[PDB]
Amino acid sequence: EASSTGRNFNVEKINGEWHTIILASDKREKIEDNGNFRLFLEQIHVLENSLVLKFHTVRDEECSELSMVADKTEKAGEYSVTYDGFNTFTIPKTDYDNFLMAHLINEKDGETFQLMGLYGREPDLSSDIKERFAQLCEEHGILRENIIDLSNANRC
Ligand SMILES: CCC(=O)CCC(C)(C)O
């Protein structure tokens, strides 16, 4: 297990397929049925100073491809991407082969909100990992009512 902000982090290892398992935010509407941030990650392609992120959005079961590139910032293990405002994110924890936890801060017109996600190499993860994710969300001030499990709706 490693953190993108640590020194033993090997970016190249998060390359490949991933799935959105759980999404959480202190701004629930952002990840609800019609939210701009209810994104289902499909793949991460690691570049020297960037990350190519491929997702799909869903509207009444219809899926649409979406891609974007996040660039490294001045801070180690942190990336930024423009999407409905300015976003910076880090990877507080991942084991490379099974799960990945992300933490993002969005700033738009003086307004801010944070989003945290749990991603898996498989379309679902154990309840222990999910609970461990819920505990990290708590530490960031995000309550369970604002945590949404999408493991049963992440496929097209
Ligand atoms: C605009 C980019 C996102 O919402 C999701 C970022 C990750 C996959 C890092 O959590």
From Swiss-Prot:
Database matches in InterPro entries: Calycin, Lipocalin, Lipocalin_CS, Lipocln_cytosolic_FA-bd_dom, Maj_urinary
Gene3D superfamilies, alphabetized: 2.40.128.20
Tissue: Abundant in the urine of adult male mice but absent from that of females.
Paired cysteines (S-S): C63-C156
GO CC annotation terms, alphabetical: cytosol; extracellular space; nucleus
Function per UniProt: Binds pheromones that are released from drying urine of males. These pheromones affect the sexual behavior of females.
Protein family per UniProt: Belongs to the calycin superfamily. Lipocalin family.
Name of the protein in question: Major urinary protein 6
Gene transcribed to yield this protein: Mup6
